[PDB]
């Protein structure tokens, strides 16, 4: 199947704190495997998955030394951004970054990524061609022009097509699973009415769809749900409910769609 690696990086300035806090999280296939945090006693990249422990000291020392450069890079960029937007001192500001690569089932590069957000909103991003930049804000054109004259896109294209891909292969090999949902329906009175709640439990990954049908067509209005949420053990949960006349429990059918199933599940309230 397809694979991916991601690095999510954050720099936070606060009202008085003197210098920003820097956090970098690495993901392989949308699961965390390394983390760096400038708040820690001895700030370093630390393994966050058991399969990462097989890397030796000079791997972690090289990653950590890069995270210290990033920390400075974000500090200077937070300072420049303050002036681009004519923001005064004494506020809280955030800088964010997502970078990484997507691989197909053949382990070849599908797409690279490099995006930035200031104050949680899109600031500048590398286009799919890995050659040109998109920057919407007027304050962001200053950065787009600097990065075009310096040719920064070439540096990131080389990283995304080379190191991002090859180190992901190494991570994939060393770490080379989905959990299918278990579903059930519950019964709750509403005098003269009843709600049926279709549960989905223990599934991984998080993407899932729950539908209800009235002996035929889907129910889009009338459908109460919750956003998919982590159980805390690595799996996820979700439910969807509909209000139903008390004698019509069996004219309603829950469907569960998940990438780990042979086919969608089909289930009703069974007393």
């Amino acid at each position: 199947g397809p694979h991916s690696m991601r690095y999510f990086e954050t720099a936070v300035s606060r009202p008085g704190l003197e210098e920003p806090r820097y956090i970098s999280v690495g993901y392989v296939d949308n699961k965390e495997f390394v983390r760096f945090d400038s708040d820690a006693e001895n700030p370093r990249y630390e393994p966050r998955a058991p399969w990462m422990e097989q890397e030796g000291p000079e791997y972690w020392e090289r990653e950590t030394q890069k995270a210290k450069g990033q920390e400075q890079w974000f500090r200077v960029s937070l300072r420049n951004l303050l002036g681009y937007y004519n923001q005064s001192a004494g506020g809280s500001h955030t800088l964010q970054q997502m970078s990484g690569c997507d691989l197909g089932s053949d382990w070849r590069l599908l797409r690279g990524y490099l995006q930035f957000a200031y104050e949680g909103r899109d600031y500048i991003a590398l286009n799919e061609d890995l050659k040109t930049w998109t920057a919407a804000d007027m304050a962001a054109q200053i950065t787009r022009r600097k990065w075009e004259q310096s040719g920064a896109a070439e540096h990131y294209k080389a990283y995304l097509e080379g190191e991002c891909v090859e180190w992901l292969h190494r991570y994939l090999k060393n770490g080379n699973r989905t959990d299918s949902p278990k579903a059930h329906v519950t019964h709750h009175p509403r005098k003269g009415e009843v709600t049926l709640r279709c549960w989905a439990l223990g599934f991984y990954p998080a993407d899932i769809t729950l539908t209800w049908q009235l002996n035929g067509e889907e129910l889009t209005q009338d459908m109460e749900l919750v956003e998919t949420r982590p159980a805390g053990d690595g799996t996820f949960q979700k439910w969807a409910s509909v209000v139903v006349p008390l004698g019509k429990e069996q004219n309603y059918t829950c469907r569960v769609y998940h990438e780990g199933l042979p086919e969608p599940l089909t289930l009703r309230w069974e007393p």
Binding site: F8, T10, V12, E119, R197, R229, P230, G232
Partner: protein
């Protein structure tokens, strides 16, 4: 700008009176990342509350999972209280066993 925390309070395993379980407080879609989260039993702050590390999703918004041990009874009320700059007042979400 500031983004308002969405909060879910729920158990890791289907709740059973008298049986140990994990209670989760899931807080998503908020900005800036600074946030206070407290979990409550009958109005009292539950000690030893585990907090996941700062993370954010594709849309740049941050999320945090808080959890703690608990044993549901028929009469105990569990809640999660969240303080964030997007709100003038803290937001309390109460646990509902059937949700």
């Amino acid at each position: 700008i500031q983004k308002t925390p969405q909060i879910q309070v729920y158990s890791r395993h289907p709740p059973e009176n008298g049986k140990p379980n994990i209670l989760n407080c899931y807080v998503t879609q908020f900005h800036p990342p600074h946030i206070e989260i407290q979990m409550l039993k009958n109005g009292k702050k539950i000690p030893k509350v585990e907090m996941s590390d700062m993370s954010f999703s594709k849309d740049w918004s941050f999320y945090i999972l808080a959890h703690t041990e608990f044993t549901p009874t028929e009469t105990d009320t569990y809640a999660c209280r969240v303080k964030h700059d997007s709100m003038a007042e803290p937001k309390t979400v109460y646990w509902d066993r059937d949700m």
